[PDB]
mmCIF file of C-alpha atoms and ligand atoms in Angstrom:
data_model
loop_
_atom_site.group_PDB
_atom_site.id
_atom_site.type_symbol
_atom_site.label_atom_id
_atom_site.label_comp_id
_atom_site.label_asym_id
_atom_site.label_seq_id
_atom_site.Cartn_x
_atom_site.Cartn_y
_atom_site.Cartn_z
ATOM 1 C CA UNK A 22 29.835 1.312 -3.804
ATOM 2 C CA UNK A 23 30.533 2.161 -0.178
ATOM 3 C CA UNK A 24 26.801 1.879 0.560
ATOM 4 C CA UNK A 25 26.335 -1.427 -1.278
ATOM 5 C CA UNK A 26 29.258 -2.915 0.663
ATOM 6 C CA UNK A 27 27.616 -1.713 3.877
ATOM 7 C CA UNK A 28 24.302 -3.276 2.837
ATOM 8 C CA UNK A 29 26.189 -6.492 2.107
ATOM 9 C CA UNK A 30 28.672 -6.892 4.969
ATOM 10 C CA UNK A 31 26.777 -5.052 7.757
ATOM 11 C CA UNK A 32 23.009 -5.108 7.107
ATOM 12 C CA UNK A 33 22.533 -8.433 5.325
ATOM 13 C CA UNK A 34 25.097 -10.197 7.535
ATOM 14 C CA UNK A 35 23.143 -9.130 10.628
ATOM 15 C CA UNK A 36 19.793 -10.122 9.110
ATOM 16 C CA UNK A 37 21.002 -13.405 7.595
ATOM 17 C CA UNK A 38 22.135 -14.978 10.885
ATOM 18 C CA UNK A 39 19.083 -13.812 12.858
ATOM 19 C CA UNK A 40 17.014 -16.575 14.447
ATOM 20 C CA UNK A 41 13.883 -15.409 12.553
ATOM 21 C CA UNK A 42 15.694 -15.272 9.181
ATOM 22 C CA UNK A 43 15.449 -18.897 8.018
ATOM 23 C CA UNK A 44 12.129 -18.486 6.114
ATOM 24 C CA UNK A 45 13.620 -15.553 4.179
ATOM 25 C CA UNK A 46 16.983 -17.003 3.058
ATOM 26 C CA UNK A 47 15.608 -18.579 -0.138
ATOM 27 C CA UNK A 48 12.593 -18.041 -2.417
ATOM 28 C CA UNK A 49 9.164 -19.082 -1.205
ATOM 29 C CA UNK A 50 8.601 -22.589 -2.591
ATOM 30 C CA UNK A 51 4.833 -22.581 -3.118
ATOM 31 C CA UNK A 52 4.812 -26.168 -4.384
ATOM 32 C CA UNK A 53 6.697 -27.570 -1.403
ATOM 33 C CA UNK A 54 4.445 -25.539 0.911
ATOM 34 C CA UNK A 55 1.174 -26.367 -0.841
ATOM 35 C CA UNK A 56 0.316 -22.683 -1.416
ATOM 36 C CA UNK A 57 -1.216 -22.628 -4.916
ATOM 37 C CA UNK A 58 -2.410 -19.041 -4.448
ATOM 38 C CA UNK A 59 1.000 -17.629 -3.461
ATOM 39 C CA UNK A 60 2.089 -16.557 -6.938
ATOM 40 C CA UNK A 61 -1.411 -15.391 -7.821
ATOM 41 C CA UNK A 62 -1.185 -12.867 -4.967
ATOM 42 C CA UNK A 63 2.554 -12.107 -4.882
ATOM 43 C CA UNK A 64 3.680 -10.980 -8.345
ATOM 44 C CA UNK A 65 7.235 -9.878 -7.354
ATOM 45 C CA UNK A 66 8.745 -12.589 -5.151
ATOM 46 C CA UNK A 67 11.875 -11.541 -3.275
ATOM 47 C CA UNK A 68 14.138 -13.148 -0.671
ATOM 48 C CA UNK A 69 17.479 -12.565 0.995
ATOM 49 C CA UNK A 70 19.268 -15.272 -1.006
ATOM 50 C CA UNK A 71 18.358 -13.389 -4.194
ATOM 51 C CA UNK A 72 19.381 -10.011 -2.724
ATOM 52 C CA UNK A 73 22.651 -11.511 -1.510
ATOM 53 C CA UNK A 74 23.460 -12.969 -4.927
ATOM 54 C CA UNK A 75 22.656 -9.585 -6.485
ATOM 55 C CA UNK A 76 25.042 -7.845 -4.088
ATOM 56 C CA UNK A 77 27.790 -10.359 -4.920
ATOM 57 C CA UNK A 78 27.353 -10.120 -8.720
ATOM 58 C CA UNK A 79 27.206 -6.288 -8.750
ATOM 59 C CA UNK A 80 23.625 -6.266 -10.027
ATOM 60 C CA UNK A 81 22.760 -3.083 -8.095
ATOM 61 C CA UNK A 82 23.596 0.392 -9.370
ATOM 62 C CA UNK A 83 22.518 2.239 -6.182
ATOM 63 C CA UNK A 84 21.934 1.416 -2.514
ATOM 64 C CA UNK A 85 18.266 2.416 -2.826
ATOM 65 C CA UNK A 86 17.697 -0.350 -5.405
ATOM 66 C CA UNK A 87 18.913 -2.950 -2.921
ATOM 67 C CA UNK A 88 16.829 -1.400 -0.110
ATOM 68 C CA UNK A 89 13.782 -1.603 -2.404
ATOM 69 C CA UNK A 90 14.317 -5.376 -2.718
ATOM 70 C CA UNK A 91 14.494 -5.784 1.073
ATOM 71 C CA UNK A 92 11.234 -3.820 1.288
ATOM 72 C CA UNK A 93 9.512 -5.957 -1.354
ATOM 73 C CA UNK A 94 10.468 -9.108 0.546
ATOM 74 C CA UNK A 95 8.946 -7.783 3.765
ATOM 75 C CA UNK A 96 5.803 -6.333 2.241
ATOM 76 C CA UNK A 97 5.169 -9.549 0.266
ATOM 77 C CA UNK A 98 5.110 -11.321 3.619
ATOM 78 C CA UNK A 99 2.600 -8.871 5.146
ATOM 79 C CA UNK A 100 0.356 -8.938 2.070
ATOM 80 C CA UNK A 101 0.099 -12.713 1.689
ATOM 81 C CA UNK A 102 -0.060 -14.047 5.246
ATOM 82 C CA UNK A 103 -2.749 -13.711 7.904
ATOM 83 C CA UNK A 104 -2.144 -10.921 10.460
ATOM 84 C CA UNK A 105 -1.934 -13.541 13.218
ATOM 85 C CA UNK A 106 0.687 -15.729 11.470
ATOM 86 C CA UNK A 107 4.061 -15.985 13.265
ATOM 87 C CA UNK A 108 5.848 -15.213 9.978
ATOM 88 C CA UNK A 109 4.412 -11.663 10.128
ATOM 89 C CA UNK A 110 5.963 -11.099 13.561
ATOM 90 C CA UNK A 111 9.235 -12.538 12.242
ATOM 91 C CA UNK A 112 9.255 -10.173 9.225
ATOM 92 C CA UNK A 113 8.461 -7.157 11.449
ATOM 93 C CA UNK A 114 11.378 -7.985 13.766
ATOM 94 C CA UNK A 115 13.794 -8.350 10.856
ATOM 95 C CA UNK A 116 12.485 -5.236 9.126
ATOM 96 C CA UNK A 117 13.132 -3.132 12.241
ATOM 97 C CA UNK A 118 16.768 -4.295 12.288
ATOM 98 C CA UNK A 119 16.991 -3.443 8.582
ATOM 99 C CA UNK A 120 15.866 0.139 9.190
ATOM 100 C CA UNK A 121 18.018 0.478 12.306
ATOM 101 C CA UNK A 122 21.131 -0.546 10.350
ATOM 102 C CA UNK A 123 20.125 1.526 7.307
ATOM 103 C CA UNK A 124 20.013 4.601 9.540
ATOM 104 C CA UNK A 125 23.792 4.273 10.030
ATOM 105 C CA UNK A 126 24.641 3.573 6.387
ATOM 106 C CA UNK A 127 27.666 5.686 5.372
ATOM 107 C CA UNK A 128 26.736 8.521 3.078
ATOM 108 C CA UNK B 20 19.861 16.112 15.036
ATOM 109 C CA UNK B 21 21.127 16.313 11.453
ATOM 110 C CA UNK B 22 19.215 13.164 10.494
ATOM 111 C CA UNK B 23 15.957 14.337 12.063
ATOM 112 C CA UNK B 24 16.150 17.618 10.143
ATOM 113 C CA UNK B 25 16.588 15.567 6.981
ATOM 114 C CA UNK B 26 13.606 13.353 7.810
ATOM 115 C CA UNK B 27 11.595 16.527 8.458
ATOM 116 C CA UNK B 28 12.626 18.721 5.511
ATOM 117 C CA UNK B 29 13.219 16.033 2.832
ATOM 118 C CA UNK B 30 11.257 12.874 3.660
ATOM 119 C CA UNK B 31 8.123 14.198 5.387
ATOM 120 C CA UNK B 32 7.949 17.159 3.014
ATOM 121 C CA UNK B 33 8.033 14.765 0.057
ATOM 122 C CA UNK B 34 5.449 12.317 1.428
ATOM 123 C CA UNK B 35 3.043 14.827 3.010
ATOM 124 C CA UNK B 36 2.343 16.624 -0.270
ATOM 125 C CA UNK B 37 2.171 13.469 -2.410
ATOM 126 C CA UNK B 38 -1.071 12.842 -4.281
ATOM 127 C CA UNK B 39 -1.417 9.427 -2.581
ATOM 128 C CA UNK B 40 -0.826 10.772 0.936
ATOM 129 C CA UNK B 41 -4.361 11.814 1.873
ATOM 130 C CA UNK B 42 -5.443 8.454 3.443
ATOM 131 C CA UNK B 43 -2.348 8.597 5.681
ATOM 132 C CA UNK B 44 -2.469 12.236 6.858
ATOM 133 C CA UNK B 45 -4.756 11.441 9.827
ATOM 134 C CA UNK B 46 -5.206 8.359 12.018
ATOM 135 C CA UNK B 47 -7.412 5.691 10.491
ATOM 136 C CA UNK B 48 -10.965 6.486 11.620
ATOM 137 C CA UNK B 49 -12.627 3.087 12.009
ATOM 138 C CA UNK B 50 -16.043 4.658 12.681
ATOM 139 C CA UNK B 51 -15.901 6.945 9.641
ATOM 140 C CA UNK B 52 -14.683 4.044 7.492
ATOM 141 C CA UNK B 53 -16.985 1.378 8.955
ATOM 142 C CA UNK B 54 -14.097 -0.897 9.986
ATOM 143 C CA UNK B 55 -15.039 -2.441 13.372
ATOM 144 C CA UNK B 56 -12.179 -4.967 13.160
ATOM 145 C CA UNK B 57 -9.458 -2.386 12.403
ATOM 146 C CA UNK B 58 -8.223 -1.950 15.981
ATOM 147 C CA UNK B 59 -8.559 -5.654 16.699
ATOM 148 C CA UNK B 60 -6.011 -6.357 13.946
ATOM 149 C CA UNK B 61 -3.799 -3.249 14.093
ATOM 150 C CA UNK B 62 -2.493 -2.752 17.636
ATOM 151 C CA UNK B 63 -0.126 0.200 16.917
ATOM 152 C CA UNK B 64 -1.871 2.707 14.630
ATOM 153 C CA UNK B 65 0.406 5.292 13.037
ATOM 154 C CA UNK B 66 -0.058 8.075 10.500
ATOM 155 C CA UNK B 67 1.779 10.958 8.871
ATOM 156 C CA UNK B 68 0.003 13.598 10.936
ATOM 157 C CA UNK B 69 1.332 12.039 14.125
ATOM 158 C CA UNK B 70 4.856 11.662 12.720
ATOM 159 C CA UNK B 71 4.793 15.245 11.425
ATOM 160 C CA UNK B 72 3.678 16.515 14.829
ATOM 161 C CA UNK B 73 6.397 14.487 16.559
ATOM 162 C CA UNK B 74 9.020 15.973 14.226
ATOM 163 C CA UNK B 75 7.709 19.503 14.826
ATOM 164 C CA UNK B 76 7.693 19.022 18.621
ATOM 165 C CA UNK B 77 11.158 17.390 18.851
ATOM 166 C CA UNK B 78 9.591 14.164 20.158
ATOM 167 C CA UNK B 79 12.166 11.814 18.635
ATOM 168 C CA UNK B 80 15.570 11.050 20.161
ATOM 169 C CA UNK B 81 17.001 9.211 17.128
ATOM 170 C CA UNK B 82 16.241 9.102 13.407
ATOM 171 C CA UNK B 83 15.634 5.348 13.533
ATOM 172 C CA UNK B 84 12.729 6.076 15.906
ATOM 173 C CA UNK B 85 11.077 8.279 13.283
ATOM 174 C CA UNK B 86 11.855 5.693 10.577
ATOM 175 C CA UNK B 87 10.165 2.980 12.651
ATOM 176 C CA UNK B 88 6.972 5.077 12.784
ATOM 177 C CA UNK B 89 6.934 5.455 8.990
ATOM 178 C CA UNK B 90 7.542 1.716 8.743
ATOM 179 C CA UNK B 91 4.724 0.865 11.181
ATOM 180 C CA UNK B 92 2.316 3.068 9.217
ATOM 181 C CA UNK B 93 3.019 1.244 5.957
ATOM 182 C CA UNK B 94 3.135 -2.207 7.559
ATOM 183 C CA UNK B 95 -0.269 -1.652 9.208
ATOM 184 C CA UNK B 96 -1.681 -0.976 5.778
ATOM 185 C CA UNK B 97 -0.217 -4.133 4.225
ATOM 186 C CA UNK B 98 -1.414 -6.294 7.115
ATOM 187 C CA UNK B 99 -4.950 -4.990 7.428
ATOM 188 C CA UNK B 100 -6.006 -4.482 3.823
ATOM 189 C CA UNK B 101 -6.756 -6.998 1.085
ATOM 190 C CA UNK B 102 -3.933 -7.546 -1.452
ATOM 191 C CA UNK B 103 -6.043 -6.025 -4.262
ATOM 192 C CA UNK B 104 -7.045 -2.862 -2.373
ATOM 193 C CA UNK B 105 -5.821 0.308 -4.088
ATOM 194 C CA UNK B 106 -4.584 1.622 -0.723
ATOM 195 C CA UNK B 107 -1.876 -1.054 -0.801
ATOM 196 C CA UNK B 108 -0.548 0.350 -4.101
ATOM 197 C CA UNK B 109 -0.688 3.843 -2.624
ATOM 198 C CA UNK B 110 1.284 2.760 0.451
ATOM 199 C CA UNK B 111 3.840 0.974 -1.734
ATOM 200 C CA UNK B 112 4.296 4.106 -3.846
ATOM 201 C CA UNK B 113 4.883 6.274 -0.784
ATOM 202 C CA UNK B 114 7.182 3.777 0.914
ATOM 203 C CA UNK B 115 9.420 3.564 -2.172
ATOM 204 C CA UNK B 116 9.936 7.341 -1.920
ATOM 205 C CA UNK B 117 10.599 6.935 1.826
ATOM 206 C CA UNK B 118 13.302 4.337 1.179
ATOM 207 C CA UNK B 119 14.762 6.323 -1.734
ATOM 208 C CA UNK B 120 15.148 9.415 0.437
ATOM 209 C CA UNK B 121 16.350 7.507 3.491
ATOM 210 C CA UNK B 122 19.165 6.081 1.350
ATOM 211 C CA UNK B 123 20.717 9.585 1.278
ATOM 212 C CA UNK B 124 20.118 10.586 4.885
ATOM 213 C CA UNK B 125 23.157 11.940 6.733
ATOM 214 C CA UNK B 126 25.069 9.399 8.721
ATOM 215 C CA UNK B 127 25.180 10.552 12.330
HETATM 216 C C1 CQF C 225 8.606 -15.664 4.293
HETATM 217 C C2 CQF C 225 7.204 -16.020 3.781
HETATM 218 N N1 CQF C 225 6.234 -15.184 3.425
HETATM 219 N N2 CQF C 225 5.148 -15.901 3.019
HETATM 220 C C3 CQF C 225 5.466 -17.205 3.143
HETATM 221 N N3 CQF C 225 6.720 -17.274 3.584
HETATM 222 C C4 CQF C 225 7.406 -18.564 3.863
HETATM 223 C C5 CQF C 225 8.857 -18.827 3.366
HETATM 224 C C6 CQF C 225 9.497 -20.169 3.724
HETATM 225 C C7 CQF C 225 8.709 -21.212 4.567
HETATM 226 C C8 CQF C 225 9.382 -22.540 4.925
HETATM 227 C C9 CQF C 225 8.830 -23.577 5.630
HETATM 228 N N4 CQF C 225 9.753 -24.534 5.748
HETATM 229 N N5 CQF C 225 10.912 -24.089 5.127
HETATM 230 C C10 CQF C 225 12.166 -24.822 5.022
HETATM 231 C C11 CQF C 225 10.676 -22.876 4.637
HETATM 232 C C12 CQF C 225 7.277 -20.904 5.052
HETATM 233 C C13 CQF C 225 6.637 -19.540 4.682
HETATM 234 C C14 CQF C 225 5.193 -19.258 5.197
HETATM 235 N N6 CQF C 225 4.748 -20.303 6.102
HETATM 236 C C15 CQF C 225 5.371 -20.459 7.398
HETATM 237 C C16 CQF C 225 6.468 -19.500 7.848
HETATM 238 C C17 CQF C 225 7.115 -19.695 9.204
HETATM 239 C C18 CQF C 225 6.650 -20.841 10.076
HETATM 240 CL CL1 CQF C 225 7.399 -21.086 11.651
HETATM 241 C C19 CQF C 225 5.565 -21.800 9.633
HETATM 242 C C20 CQF C 225 4.918 -21.607 8.283
HETATM 243 C C21 CQF C 225 4.138 -19.129 4.098
HETATM 244 C C22 CQF C 225 4.667 -18.494 2.827
HETATM 245 C C1 CQF C 226 -4.197 4.012 5.253
HETATM 246 C C2 CQF C 226 -5.167 2.893 5.603
HETATM 247 N N1 CQF C 226 -4.854 1.663 5.985
HETATM 248 N N2 CQF C 226 -5.986 0.964 6.224
HETATM 249 C C3 CQF C 226 -7.005 1.802 5.957
HETATM 250 N N3 CQF C 226 -6.519 2.976 5.582
HETATM 251 C C4 CQF C 226 -7.402 4.139 5.237
HETATM 252 C C5 CQF C 226 -7.149 5.552 5.865
HETATM 253 C C6 CQF C 226 -8.075 6.715 5.480
HETATM 254 C C7 CQF C 226 -9.244 6.465 4.483
HETATM 255 C C8 CQF C 226 -10.206 7.587 4.068
HETATM 256 C C9 CQF C 226 -11.281 7.411 3.235
HETATM 257 N N4 CQF C 226 -11.899 8.581 3.090
HETATM 258 N N5 CQF C 226 -11.211 9.522 3.844
HETATM 259 C C10 CQF C 226 -11.567 10.928 3.931
HETATM 260 C C11 CQF C 226 -10.181 8.912 4.437
HETATM 261 C C12 CQF C 226 -9.465 5.052 3.889
HETATM 262 C C13 CQF C 226 -8.517 3.884 4.287
HETATM 263 C C14 CQF C 226 -8.792 2.488 3.650
HETATM 264 N N6 CQF C 226 -9.920 2.553 2.729
HETATM 265 C C15 CQF C 226 -9.774 3.189 1.435
HETATM 266 C C16 CQF C 226 -8.426 3.795 1.053
HETATM 267 C C17 CQF C 226 -8.258 4.473 -0.300
HETATM 268 C C18 CQF C 226 -9.447 4.530 -1.241
HETATM 269 CL CL1 CQF C 226 -9.255 5.320 -2.811
HETATM 270 C C19 CQF C 226 -10.798 3.933 -0.868
HETATM 271 C C20 CQF C 226 -10.965 3.256 0.486
HETATM 272 C C21 CQF C 226 -9.100 1.371 4.650
HETATM 273 C C22 CQF C 226 -8.530 1.592 6.036
#
């Protein structure tokens, strides 16, 4: 759809190259990070690599479905990490760009 | 603006009357709730009452400003509360409606 192309080529492109984006470009690897509680706390993991693949393989039926995945990725970050962790500030910054760009999504 | 009317008549109307909205209709009251660390963790409190008042009083200059306030309100909840707190599920339910409606907001 027009909106899904916008989420792909405008929103995600902006978020993907951001300097705070690197932790979000692939799934959280709890083994490599030594976080054995991650998947006990976060039951719906999400990341931009997954969203991007879904956009490219036409997995989404509506823009809102893709926006829901972005939201899950951000709220997973807030739920799991300590308030004082840098990753929380990084997610907040990216999330604000997400909403800013979503406000201009063609309708 | 066209977008701000939409946020007011479609988004806020939908969230304000929701059965899970009541904890979000007023600022978090850390005395009433016995939460002496709340304002040490959450530096930008936000709530639906405030957003609703800002919409009514033409406080916002752009729709993204109003959307950021909704976002801050939900994010505060995810950051402050324990993962297993019911209020997190309530916030998630309301935010999904927020995103669903925002997906159809006018473009200008
Ligand atoms: C997003 C997100 N949400 N929850 C978490 N993650 C996350 C995803 C990836 C990486 C990582 C580390 N290395 N690589 C190649 C990737 C580290 C984290 C977090 N830890 C963290 C994040 C940023 C910094 Cl600067 C230091 C530690 C803890 C788990
Ligand atoms: C939003 C939000 N973000 N952080 C918090 N809040 C929040 C706002 C209002 C009320 C409240 C309680 N009573 N009144 C009249 C109002 C309770 C809470 C949370 N506590 C809570 C929430 C739901 C349930 Cl079912 C039980 C306890 C903890 C603090």
